[PDB]
Design a protein around this ligand. Sequence first.
Ligand code: ULG
Lengths: 106, 110
Amino acid sequence: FKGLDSKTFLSEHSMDMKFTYCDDRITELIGYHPEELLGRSAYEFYHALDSENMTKSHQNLCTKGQVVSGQYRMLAKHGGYVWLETQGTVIYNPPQCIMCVNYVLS
Amino acid sequence: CQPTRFISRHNIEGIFTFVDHRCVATVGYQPQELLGKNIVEFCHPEDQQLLRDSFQQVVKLKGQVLSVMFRFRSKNQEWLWMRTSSFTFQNPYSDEIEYIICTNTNVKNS
Ligand SMILES: O[C@@H]1CCc2c(Oc3cc(F)cc(F)c3)ccc(C(F)(F)F)c21
């Protein structure tokens, strides 16, 4: 039994969904090293059956500025899929990036 | 050009609880020189009260973004203009106390 907290990590993304930053915490939970994530689109990581829904969550996010993804599977570094739920927030300056708070369900 | 910016997390008092290592290029401190201290300690005295009231408000705003501009004292002891954009996060599976997620960018005042 890990905590809710010990299963939550942040990521930051450019507007095209590529990772620009990730907490080291993701390693423990999913196997990725943040440095191997940077420059890759988050889309690369979704299970195909959650894909169209994440495309929609992304649309609600760009237009409304904040979204709650609802349940999705992310391919894990060493095979299989982890369940997540993400809160996204767009940070606008004077759109500049997306901040994601990611919670691992499974 | 790429803006300089780092992510931090804070309790509702302002105390740094997590600092992203991009802080070194942005304000010059190591993360461990920031962890455990209140962000108001690095703030210019004309800006401290605005920043304290920003932290107080962000929790009333339902997870929406609150933004503030203030002068932050770099490891050179120079005053840098920071735009801090913040929002609360609270895992809706719990009734744990919300904490504050920040992005912090050196911007121009002009
Ligand atoms: O489109 C934004 C931008 C990137 C992203 C998102 O990325 C992640 C995808 C993963 F598989 C894992 C992760 F930690 C973040 C996860 C969720 C969303 C959200 F906001 F739901 F749309 C978004």
